[PDB]
Amino acid sequence: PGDLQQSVLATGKLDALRKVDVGAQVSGQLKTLSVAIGDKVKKDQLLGVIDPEQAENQIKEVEATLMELRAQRQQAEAELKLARVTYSRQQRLAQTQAVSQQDLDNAATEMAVKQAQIGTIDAQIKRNQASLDTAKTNLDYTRIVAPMAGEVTQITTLQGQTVIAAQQAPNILTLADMSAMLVKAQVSEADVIHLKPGQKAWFTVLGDQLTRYEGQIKDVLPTPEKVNDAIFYYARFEVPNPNGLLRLDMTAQVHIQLTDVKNVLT
Amino acid sequence: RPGDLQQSVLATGKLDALRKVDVGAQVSGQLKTLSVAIGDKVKKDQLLGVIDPEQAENQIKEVEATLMELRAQRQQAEAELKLARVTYSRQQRLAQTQAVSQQDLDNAATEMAVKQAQIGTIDAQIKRNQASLDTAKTNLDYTRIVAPMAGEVTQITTLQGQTVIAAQQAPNILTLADMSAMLVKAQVSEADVIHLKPGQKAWFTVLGDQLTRYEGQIKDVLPTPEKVNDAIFYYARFEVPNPNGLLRLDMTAQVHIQLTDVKNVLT
Amino acid sequence: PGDLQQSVLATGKLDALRKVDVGAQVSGQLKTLSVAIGDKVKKDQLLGVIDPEQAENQIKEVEATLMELRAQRQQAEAELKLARVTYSRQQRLAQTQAVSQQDLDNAATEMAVKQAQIGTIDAQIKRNQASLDTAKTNLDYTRIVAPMAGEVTQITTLQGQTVIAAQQAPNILTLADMSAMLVKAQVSEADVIHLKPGQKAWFTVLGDQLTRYEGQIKDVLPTPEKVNDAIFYYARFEVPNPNGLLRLDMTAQVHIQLTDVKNVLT
Amino acid sequence: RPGDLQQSVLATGKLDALRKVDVGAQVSGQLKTLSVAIGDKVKKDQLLGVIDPEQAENQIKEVEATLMELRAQRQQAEAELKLARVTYSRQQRLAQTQAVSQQDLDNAATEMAVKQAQIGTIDAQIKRNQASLDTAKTNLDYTRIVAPMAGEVTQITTLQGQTVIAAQQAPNILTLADMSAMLVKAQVSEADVIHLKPGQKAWFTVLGDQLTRYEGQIKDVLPTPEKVNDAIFYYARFEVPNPNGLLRLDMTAQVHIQLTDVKNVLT
Amino acid sequence: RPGDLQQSVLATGKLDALRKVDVGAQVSGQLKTLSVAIGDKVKKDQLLGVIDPEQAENQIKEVEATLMELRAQRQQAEAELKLARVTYSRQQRLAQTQAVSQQDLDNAATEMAVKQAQIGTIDAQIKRNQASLDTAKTNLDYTRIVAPMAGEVTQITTLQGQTVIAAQQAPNILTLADMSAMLVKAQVSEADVIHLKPGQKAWFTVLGDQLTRYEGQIKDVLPTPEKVNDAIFYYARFEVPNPNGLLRLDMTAQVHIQLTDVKNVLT
Amino acid sequence: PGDLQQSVLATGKLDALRKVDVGAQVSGQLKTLSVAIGDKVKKDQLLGVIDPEQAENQIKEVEATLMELRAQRQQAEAELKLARVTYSRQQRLAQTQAVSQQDLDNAATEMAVKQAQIGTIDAQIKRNQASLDTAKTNLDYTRIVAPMAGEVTQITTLQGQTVIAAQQAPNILTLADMSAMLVKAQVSEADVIHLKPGQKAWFTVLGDQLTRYEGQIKDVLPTPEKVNDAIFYYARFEVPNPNGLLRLDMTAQVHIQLTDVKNVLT
């Protein structure tokens, strides 16, 4: 009854928990950017604005169209007020003989068209409420706000540059959460099926090789990467980064305990 | 003298997904929500992500509205339908006593006919736009990304928050992959390809499994080979079960194929 | 009276007679593909279909527009029926004095407008027959059928993937005829003008170097290709491939007999 | 025994613009005129180039015109406004003596109301197009290229005469650069990055200045490092004045940073 | 002492098409038919291929139709033209006896004038669309690919069946090439380029022709040279007949140029 | 009181004073090109034409629309002629009692609408003058003329080829002025701050190393270029090229005199 267990050393890479690259869905010049790398932002914090002015005129243009139909209904309800008195007035001269039926029948039928009149316009006054909205959520597109809470990792698009998305979404800046990081470990295929979720594992960090970071694996990527023409596989675990220490692509020495069962005889 | 001829052939083959597909989008906008992770099994048609829809929602309201504008605008011609109708009648009666000639009888009778076509001119208006609504509804489907096949996310290209524009190149959200079975592309030489016939029995093992030999028969070859700098190689495929998780993508494999073995006969 | 003739060995490449790469002219998701590599298809066999549904709504939308004008003519011919009786009725009360000319002249002129009326609409009922057709041959564009009869050489676009052609035609799959193949032979410039259409030539095939394939050249490509920084030229001939043997880019040893005239003394 | 620990760290850093930006265009057309040279200081908003505007000039004239078509088309409804008005009045008077009932009084009084709405239906027409004019005017701004920041033209990509098309990729006319100050990106090792804290005093010199040492403190680091084939390096930045012209872009610099120097104490 | 100076200069030149051009298309659709092969001589304007036209055929029918809708819609105003005309007349006659004042005479006479303008409002409608028809007809030309110059197909990029989309990059169907004559770009050194003057007599042979020397004079140089990793080279061109098929593209040639030869004189 | 001064040798490059690459803003086939490399052109000389024919139909289409409104005004002024006589005629039967006021008031008000009538149309007859112009300066876009006076350096786009600019401006040909050339000299960073505008400098030209070209520097580029992974800087001066001598990218040996002050003792 002896022992048998094996560890696998691997070179790993430290990465941010959540890493995003903000984009613009609109074209024009990036008027104002309000961050530089190092600024920490909240989720939904206005990160920058692209030239809205033309998307604003696109609103003037609409609301104005909304006042046009607004004075039309006011022409429908005038017809309605008239065609509705003429009605009664004759509905009355009816039991008194002074209109008969015909005239009365042609008077009530207008009465109805005039009714179906403010209805036509109103649906239009309604359709455009939705043409103003759709022309507004574009001005909600000139405001480049964040998709998550993190740190401004990089700004590939600076204040002053022009951005046209017509056929390719731009890349304004990129955020990333550093709190909890990640350690994509390179464990060759020659020994990945021995790598099982929930195993030990610890690592140093080149500069300062004696501080150690604990951590149990909890991930493995089905998608490999060839290195020198030798396929590997990332193995992952989580390590908290409450302070600065540990940055993007900071190398590491990973240690993993595949087997450890003790006393059974090899 | 009696004997037997037969020739083997080892081969450094590669291993990969029985079925793999890359799923994108036909609509622009930002990827507001993405519900799966780099390793979940999904069921077909399952929803994987949603793209900013506030827009298509805005097109719909603009189209429903239009229907209603025509919805009432018909209500109007439905009242005219009764004026030229009742009068027609009422004038057909007085007409038997001789009311305003026959000219007027026709004139007004064909007035009930014009007004009758006015309604259809409308009913069709709706139907058309009722068909535009589908076209507005339909794009609302193109905002939500659903898994076209069942498998496990082999990767996630377009993250959650990133912004896609589909006008040029359809984006790439997350590749799926049926790993149920795994084809193994044994890369044989163009000097052996000459032989090798469908269903020919072959075995192979992975570099890290030592001896746990796997095996079956070959299923075909791919007409389109590919050169590894020198030497033209082809691919002789495989169909082996991949339960128990094992067999990861592009995992290497040492294959051996058994060209032929006609034994005991004039050689 | 002796002899003089020379042969030129060259490395050649075997290729398919006709090789095509099917494309889509429409965007959307490729719903169904009905072939894998190895499937042999007939010319005009439906190879696959991209999401038609929206190109279908594009039809509902039109036919409906075709019923609209269809009830309009039905409003033109009602006017016509009326304005054509009023005519006669007065054409008659004419020789009887009851209308004179004026009225009659204004009655015949309507008679004509009403005529030119069903004509206006009809041309419209006709224009749209051609708006339905044009909106239909697009639904004839969701059906990716073959441009020739061959073998599915490769499928670069698989079932499930999205295809948008707006600014670049996609590549669904590629077919190729293998019956008769081709052998683009590499015969250097140092000796191409000696290479003449109709000359001998034979070749082996690496794996199995003793089976020989006959064939007289019948082609030569004016367009060269540099190799190691040395310009060559393809020379061609046809060889039938009734069976499997011989694949795309399968190497070969080509032999060519430029001269052979015998007995004249060098 | 008492002592002191402290560790230096030299570093081959690089030097560059405190502020740099690349200026393009949102409109196509040919670059008819470009007013600056590969080395002039500009003031903000200064005009650098103009793109062929004959077109936007043509859109404006088409829109002003439209305003005028509505400008007169209102003048018409302004005369109707007086017919239904004066009559209304004049019929209210005769009405007290009993002119054509009350039916006609209303009918014509509400005629002055319909005609009254006709004007607004117009005034709004204008206002809309008065807002289209801004949209036509606004693009006329997008033809003239103005300097978004003050500095000196570090380069000129799009020459004068060349023709740009902005529909895909926004072009690139001339990069500007504030050289007032110059950041120096000391590329330190990922094995030293561990240390190095904001404001830490450091000195450096250029390869051609021999000894004229420059110095200050570090301002930060960039979270996104970058590998030089091997070894992961980061960038510790600088803020030094660059008067007297010196310090050109990407000019090399030999940096030394002073990690720490706690002296006299238990080590 | 009397003598003579003169310096030669050999040069590894290259050979190619006197005239070459790449022919594409302005319209999308699939290449339904392609009538030439990788080596046929064509005549100018000859038809080489056709792109799926069912569409432009559909635009035409939609435009001819429109003409007809206006073709009849005029036939209507041509009957009104006779009502206000005959009445005018007939009312001018009765008018001399004093029919319905003069007011009505004018009113109806100017009615023959309004109706008269109605026709023109139409005739112009047609003419416009008669010009749209050309625009519809014209695109039908852009479906058939015709040879812009006479020569022989040096290549075929876009095959028959492949599908082209012209919206971004104009495709490439089949390059043509006038091989009648062949320019030979002798690549001379930037240290010799100094000399070399138009029309300067030079000879050359191909690597496989041994000795069958070809020769003429140089025609020019190209202002834009090109480096072969090191050494800046220019191109001194040639104009030699290429009958009997010989001289293929990019075929190599050993050129010798004769800088100068002023003989017998004070050197 | 001795001396001290230093020169810096550098490899330089000769370039053209002004170098442009002509573009097209229109798509279609390049019908005619009227230059080959070596042709010297004047500023605004028609360099080539792309297929105008469709941009021409775009005019027929417009002028025709300009005749439509042209016969409309002719319908407005007929109404005007009528509604303006009826006016007077009653303005007169006014002081004679035969119209009163009402009728007169309804007659003058038409009189005004008819006035505001030729005005409506006229503004339209005017708007289109600007729709014809805008549709004309596009036919001014089928004529590829020069942006400066120089020499046809290169023709990347030849007669016969198709050019579509939709999403990328093409490159027809490139001109360049050779009169006065330029000599971008490579003077390393190790010694650029010693390089001062207005200093001596002379250079040879490989082929023929004894003819010398004088020239004082008058330029320096803030933007460097790495060579072998060593950053340099261009230094410039002007040299006239009245003849052929000196071409694009013709190498040179540059000489520069940074310091020269004499007699002060080192």
Curated annotation (Swiss-Prot), chains B, D, E:
Q: Which stretch of the intact protein is present?
A: 42 to 308 of 371
Keyword Repeat found: no
Q: How does it assemble?
A: Homohexamer. Part of the tripartite efflux system MacAB-TolC, which is composed of an inner membrane transporter, MacB, a periplasmic membrane fusion protein, MacA, and an outer membrane component, TolC. The complex forms a large protein conduit and can translocate molecules across both the inner and outer membranes. MacA interacts with MacB and TolC, and this interaction changes its conformation.
Superkingdom of the organism of origin: Bacteria
Swiss-Prot/TrEMBL keywords:
Antibiotic resistance, Cell inner membrane, Cell membrane, Coiled coil, Membrane, Transmembrane, Transmembrane helix, Transport
- State the coiled-coil residue ranges: 51-96
Comment field on protein domains: The periplasmic domain is sufficient to bind MacB. The membrane proximal (MP) region plays a critical role in the stimulation of MacB ATPase activity.
Subcellular compartments: Cell inner membrane
Periplasmic face residues: 1-267
Q: Which organism is it from?
A: Escherichia coli (strain K12)
Return the protein name.
Macrolide export protein MacA
- Name the major location: membrane
Functionally, this protein is described as follows: Part of the tripartite efflux system MacAB-TolC. MacA stimulates the ATPase activity of MacB by promoting the closed ATP-bound state of MacB, increases the capacity of MacB to bind macrolides such as erythromycin, and provides a physical link between MacB and TolC. When overexpressed, the system confers resistance against macrolides composed of 14- and 15-membered lactones but no or weak resistance against 16-membered ones. In addition, MacA binds tightly rough-core lipopolysaccharide (R-LPS), suggesting that the system could also transport R-LPS or a similar glycolipid.
Q: Which residues form the signal peptide?
A: none
Q: Which GO terms describe its molecular function?
A: efflux transmembrane transporter activity; identical protein binding; polymyxin transmembrane transporter activity
Its placement in the membrane is given as:
Single-pass membrane protein
GO terms of biological process kind: polymyxin transport; response to antibiotic; xenobiotic detoxification by transmembrane export across the plasma membrane
- Gene Ontology CC annotations of this record: efflux pump complex; extrinsic component of membrane; MacAB-TolC complex; membrane; plasma membrane
Tell me, using the record's free text, what induces this protein. Expressed at very low levels under standard laboratory conditions.
Which gene holds the coding sequence for this protein? Answer: macA
Report the family membership.
Answer: Belongs to the membrane fusion protein (MFP) (TC 8.A.1) family.
